[PDB]
């Protein structure tokens, strides 16, 4: 079926074992593959704190009892580049602390010194400064702060991964239905940004194809109770309820169920599949009308 | 703006002054345009005898006060192409009592003869014998019946219509949102017929623009009370309410919206316009949740 | 382990030879351990059934591990009938339609309900537009809607049928190309129309279904393949002018065999995919996501 | 009468010549009778302003009739900024910059309030991306936030401070291409992904606006026009080839004249539009139903 032994693999954002970037990583070592992660260094720490303390262990188990092992968890900034991009405040910021080598840039250097070239890519991190405030209130700063954390950081994660990728690699984003449709609460120009995330899939899905023969695909995913979620009865408790009643699989939306489609097209499966946003969302995409809307009979 | 005059129009789908066929036509002569029907044979007597009586002349009037005029009230059944197909029942039955020359090809050659060749042709009528039943209920004979009254009829109306077409000629077709994404209710498979409409739109864009030179483009359109929709508080009064309340456009949708729109893509300001689908529906098409769900609060 | 079907049992509807997606489908559920059953057009059971029996398809029946794909039956069926009574007296005595009886839908559905319980999977690899070398404008109505009635009215009869003989979780997935969404000229005689309609009606299904039964729909829309049913379309093939426009245009420079297709419904069909439903994936070395030929003549060499 | 705009007024935002769409609009929102006026960004205010004046544009600014479109007010007007306090003192004090001030959004949206009063209509014809002709791949990070806070958010601005001088049932239309949803190769530098932002919050915002202010938003996917702008995308111009291939490729076998879009334009902020919003319009000749490019060297001329 689908035994990745003996390709390398890197999953950028991961910081916990609620995001849909663990879920990615676990299925990934499942079939066999080496697997890295890339962490948001303030919070780095405390990630390692938690796998070192043994506290994850019952999140990392293996369906036959091994625990999943990390070739590596690497210190990453998507907002960064190279090192001449980092402003003065953060090279000072405590929270940096004796971390060095965390721009794009640079962990790509480290991964191939570390490791070798690689075969998969993974791209799970996103952030809205202004992401609760409607679009006609959110300023420019903002917009362009939810444009570079949460879309150019795929491109440039392409842009310098890509050089180092095994041909008929693949590469995996995560966006949201708002990059569609009007998805309200999913301010900040988040949506912008996550529409331009598929684009720039589509678009990179040629440029890596070409150059590099590797395949770059979305997955458009429904609402998941990540930390990163939680953070915004809360808004994303709203979205659970919304997808799980005018769906049409009444079923509860797992971090896994993402992480299994991610394998997929991050395995010789789907080798002919590229450019491609797929929808790992109990299949509300599909919906052109709310059932449970207040306009029809109960 | 758009003097349509010295232009002919065929308008296929009017035997009343509330569907979307009347709008159409009644902003077609508000332009200039010489202005003709195709009318279900059963419900023709009845439609002439409303115009003759002078009670339709409320709606026929035109913002100076003229009342518009039609060049010709032709009796067409859509389900039938040439006189070949048409049955001996039907032949026999009594609502086609009296008329002659219905099927698509013979009302083509009438209208060269009567009023020579023409500019504009408006497609706007749809039969689903099953509509009422969900597609895991439509039988074979329904699904089909809906596909041949509602899609085909645009194919074969574009066939015989298009070689007595000028060249900038346009046509318009007008399909429903379940093409796309599911509305419960819009059953019998005329959801997939209208996606079949929307497909020939686009595939006919091809061949009559470049075999006649002709313009053709399709009316995503929302909720309207004709008596076509009345006939399915009702299902289509439901769907206005939906539409009131969860659309970009807090307000009513009238018939004319489509004619509007259906004037555009008719007239000279639309020469680069072909293969498209254009919602006129209050921009609920661009939504992706229900704001007035249960799931919310109030 | 990622990937585990032993237990569950699929039925794979158009399967006459061994070039086609169908023939990677059941190819790619079975490797997966799957017990596969298949569904034949009456007229080319005869010559399907040999070509087994005989051995001259054991070079395709290999699997990676080096054993060879069985089948839990190999079912007459047509797709154009639902019911016996939905047939003609013509065939009823077509030559080629004697030896065989039980091939409309519901008996096919109700044999392999006799025969092998309950399934978890279905594939629905068929279609057939007599007028398919016909543009639109050319094409007659009659051959229009048999077009429909035989590429996607199917599918929604083959639903009804193997709907309550299928396992809350079940998949069924059935295949579309491009011609849906987008003006591919020479695949006319209203093809193009009836794919479209299928990929609606895998919406459509997909929430019906999927609420009834709690089953998962799916459509995996394909690039060009040269299989029996493509090179019957229309020298040089219709069918490898458009492999060689892909080849030349699509992001992923590389040859398409089937088993590609074949892997990517295993996918759709396995509880990998089990908050997967009502998508259109496309599998077409990336061709979809293209806005202009690279190759025009336009353009410069 | 069909289309009356007698007593509307309408603000075309990018407009430096008589070559781009912007032009196209401001000349058919005129006809349509509307008072229009412009902004033009700064730095070439002045060479615009004197083609105006002296005359070299008259043949350019005759409408149908046979008089001359006028304007209420030519603004100078810089979208990459909102308020004078964004203003870096690098263009403070640039040569070409001297002579003017008040040329943020939210200042002339203020002038206007002043000087015109209330609007209904509002155009955004403009787009800025640095790295254009640099793929992807090459592009740099300062340079694709630049083409996205030009080309995109520019426009949301632009509603945020022209919205509360708008009225109820005004309208708001953008200009996108095709990249957006496609790959266009050659566009780059992160134009391809502004655009898509665009056509995004031209779905967003048409909720937002279509809610609090009562106004409409549209997007108008337009096809390929030689104007200034593109000609300075890249001999044989970049531009050339794509209007090349569309005129191959297209299934209107025509030129694209800008006045086109401008009339597809002038519908979409008209009473004859007002259920219409949130749309992307292609004028494009229909360029984008095609799944082919018809003249591609893999098939047979
Ligand atoms: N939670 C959901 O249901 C949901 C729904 C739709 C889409 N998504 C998408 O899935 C992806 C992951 O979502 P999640 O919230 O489950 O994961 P998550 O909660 O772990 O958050 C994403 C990770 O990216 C990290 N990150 C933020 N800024 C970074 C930076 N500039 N450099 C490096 N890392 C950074 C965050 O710390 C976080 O660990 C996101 O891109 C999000 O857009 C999530
Ligand atoms: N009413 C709405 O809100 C609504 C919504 C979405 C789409 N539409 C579409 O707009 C079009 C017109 O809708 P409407 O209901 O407003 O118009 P309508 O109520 O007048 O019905 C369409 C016309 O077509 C005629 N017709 C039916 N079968 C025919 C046949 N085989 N040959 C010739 N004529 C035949 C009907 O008699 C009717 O007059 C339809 O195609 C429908 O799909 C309507
Ligand atoms: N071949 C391609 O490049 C291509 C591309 C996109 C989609 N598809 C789809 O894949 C499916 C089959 O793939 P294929 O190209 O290998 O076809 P194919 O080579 O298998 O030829 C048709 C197949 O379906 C069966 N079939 C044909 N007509 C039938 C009938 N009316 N009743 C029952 N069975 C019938 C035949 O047994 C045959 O195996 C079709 O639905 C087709 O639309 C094919
Ligand atoms: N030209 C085409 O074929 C094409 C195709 C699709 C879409 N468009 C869109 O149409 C719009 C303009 O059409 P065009 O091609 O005629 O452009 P153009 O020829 O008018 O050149 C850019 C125009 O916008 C203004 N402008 C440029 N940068 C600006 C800035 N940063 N601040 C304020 N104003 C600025 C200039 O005055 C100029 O008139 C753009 O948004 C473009 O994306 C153009
Ligand atoms: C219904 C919402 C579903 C949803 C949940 C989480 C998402 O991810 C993020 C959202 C915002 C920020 C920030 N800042 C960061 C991340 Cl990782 C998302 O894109 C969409
Ligand atoms: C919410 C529904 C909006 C809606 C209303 C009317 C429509 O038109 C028809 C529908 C069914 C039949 C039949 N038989 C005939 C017509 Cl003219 C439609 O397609 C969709
Ligand atoms: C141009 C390649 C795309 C393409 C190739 C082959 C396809 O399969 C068929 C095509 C036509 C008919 C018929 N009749 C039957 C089948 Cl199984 C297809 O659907 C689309
Ligand atoms: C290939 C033709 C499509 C195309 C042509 C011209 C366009 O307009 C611009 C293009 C680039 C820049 C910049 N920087 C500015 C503008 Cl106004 C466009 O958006 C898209």
Not at 142 to 165: E, R, T
Not at 179 to 207: C, F, H, I, N, Q
Not at 244 to 251: D, E, F, T, V
């Amino acid at each position: 079926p689908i035994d990745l032994r003996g390709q390398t693999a890197f999953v950028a954002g991961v910081a916990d074992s609620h995001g849909y970037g663990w879920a990615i990583a676990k299925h990934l070592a499942s079939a066999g593959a080496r697997v890295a992660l890339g962490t948001w260094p303030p919070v780095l720490g405390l990630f390692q704190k938690s796998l070192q303390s043994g506290r994850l262990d019952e999140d990392r188990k293996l369906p036959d009892g091994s625990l999943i092992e990390f070739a590596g968890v690497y210190p990453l900034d998507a907002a960064f580049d190279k090192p001449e991009d980092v402003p003065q405040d953060i090279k000072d910021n405590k929270r940096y602390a004796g971390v060095d080598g965390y721009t794009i840039k640079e962990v790509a250097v480290k991964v191939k010194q570390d490791l070798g070239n690689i075969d998969i890519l993974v791209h799970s991190l996103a952030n809205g400064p202004e992401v609760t405030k409607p679009l006609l209130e959110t300023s420019r700063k903002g917009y362009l702060a939810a444009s570079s954390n949460s879309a150019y950081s795929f491109v440039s994660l392409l842009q310098h991964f890509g050089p180092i990728m095994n041909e008929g690699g693949s590469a995996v984003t995560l966006s949201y239905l708002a990059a569609e449709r009007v998805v309200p609460g999913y301010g900040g120009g988040m949506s912008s940004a996550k529409a331009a995330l598929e684009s720039d899939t589509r678009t990179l899905a040629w440029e890596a194809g070409q150059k590099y023969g590797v395949r770059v695909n979305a997955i458009s995913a429904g609402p998941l109770k990540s930390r990163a979620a939680s953070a915004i009865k809360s808004f994303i408790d709203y979205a659970i309820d919304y997808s799980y009643n005018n769906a049409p699989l009444r079923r509860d939306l797992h971090s896994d169920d993402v992480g299994g489609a991610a394998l997929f097209l991050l395995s010789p499966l789907a080798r002919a599949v590229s450019g491609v946003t797929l929808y790992v969302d109990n299949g509300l995409h599909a919906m052109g009308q709310a059932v449970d809307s207040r306009s029809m009979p109960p």
